[PDB]
């Protein structure tokens, strides 16, 4: 009854290793799992040893920026319609800033190009307590019991003590911390069409009792959202797999902060439409070849999302061209 799928596994394993040598980064994890059951189908780590998805905690970055955008959505604070004011700004002496300046976004934008601005200002519409609950229903600071040794529960600040520029930067991904296993169950709640799911190291005869966090209709758009991540003019390009629309976000997350020391982090679940597998890849400290989470962590992502698609089962939903 283990959910573990050995194909699956050695996939993720040799993919995952070869991205971490090619970009000559310090380590690597992936997650696999199923996007209906939360079945974990596959862990894997590198160098050997320690189970770092499980016990390793990251400031998740932009790959935290969907749930936001969802939460915004879900409680009407802004629908897709809105264009927001994006350009850069402080709060007192604190910089929020994008990579580049976007006059203006729309949510789509803010998902598309991965603004830190825009996720900030719709983040800004809720209360720190709100947030802060918000947070830990997706999960974090709460302990996944997986069984493995050395797990913690994640980091999430009480938010009495959180300032309002600490509010900002959680919303896209610092001053919170979780594992690759945590921050990828979150993912269900957008599979799932907003029930956030438990995982299991156990295969799930029908989707386990869960937890809703959108509503459905919210969760479908947001997929939607996220497919423009993979299509020209999103930063992961890099992940979309032929013969399927694919949902996904990048993550490239300083390390402390630090002017080039990086996490890069891709993290993605198809069909998009009807989701069947969640992939999430980590790049520790890449210095060759790149450190964006697109360009590092997308490639793995799209091997790994292509060949357990191809393992289960899961015909294409366009027709192939590659
Ligand atoms: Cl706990
Ligand atoms: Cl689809």
Same mark, same amino acid.
Request: charged share 30%.
């Given at each position: 009854m283990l959910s573990l799928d050995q194909r699956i596994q050695t996939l993720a394993y040799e993919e995952l290793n070869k991205a971490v040598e090619y970009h000559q980064a310090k380590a690597g994890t992936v997650v696999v799992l199923d996007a209906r059951t939360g079945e974990i189908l596959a862990l894997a780590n590198t160098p050997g040893g320690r189970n770092r998805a499980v016990t390793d905690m990251i400031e998740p970055g932009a790959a935290i920026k969907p749930f936001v955008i969802a939460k915004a959505l879900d409680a009407?604070?802004?629908?897709?319609?809105?264009?927001?004011?994006?350009?850069?700004?402080? %709060?007192?002496?604190?910089?929020?800033? *994008?990579?580049?300046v976007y006059p203006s976004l729309d949510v789509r934008g803010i998902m598309q190009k991965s603004s830190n601005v825009g996720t900030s200002k719709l983040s800004a519409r809720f209360g720190?307590?709100?947030?802060? *609950?918000?947070?830990?229903?997706?999960? %974090?600071?709460?302990?996944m019991h997986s069984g493995f040794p050395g797990e913690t529960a994640g980091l999430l600040r009480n938010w009495r003590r959180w300032r309002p520029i600490e509010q900002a930067t959680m919303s896209f991904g610092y001053g919170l911390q979780l594992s690759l296993l945590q921050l990828a169950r979150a993912y269900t709640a957008l599979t799932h069409d907003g029930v956030l799911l438990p995982l299991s190291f156990e295969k799930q005869a029908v989707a386990p009792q869960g937890k809703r966090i959108f509503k459905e209709s919210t969760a479908r758009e947001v997929r939607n959202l996220m497919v423009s991540v993979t299509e020209p003019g999103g930063t992961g390009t890099a992940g979309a797999v032929?013969?399927? *629309?694919?949902?996904?976000?990048?993550?490239?997350?300083?390390?402390?902060?630090? *002017?080039?020391?990086?996490?890069?982090?891709? %993290?993605?679940?198809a069909p998009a439409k009807n989701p069947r597998v969640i992939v999430a890849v980590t790049i520790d400290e890449p210095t060759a070849h790149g450190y964006y989470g697109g360009v590092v962590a997308g490639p793995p992502f799209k091997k790994i999302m292509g060949g357990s698609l191809n393992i289960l089962g899961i015909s294409p939903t366009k027709p192939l061209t590659a």
């Open positions: 009407g604070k802004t629908d897709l319609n809105e264009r927001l004011n994006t350009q850069p700004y402080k %709060i007192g002496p604190s910089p929020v800033r *994008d990579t580049h720190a307590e709100e947030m802060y *609950d918000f947070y830990h229903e997706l999960g %974090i600071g709460v302990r032929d013969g399927f *629309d694919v949902g996904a976000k990048t993550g490239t997350a300083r390390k402390f902060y630090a *002017d080039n020391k990086h996490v890069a982090t891709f %993290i993605g679940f």
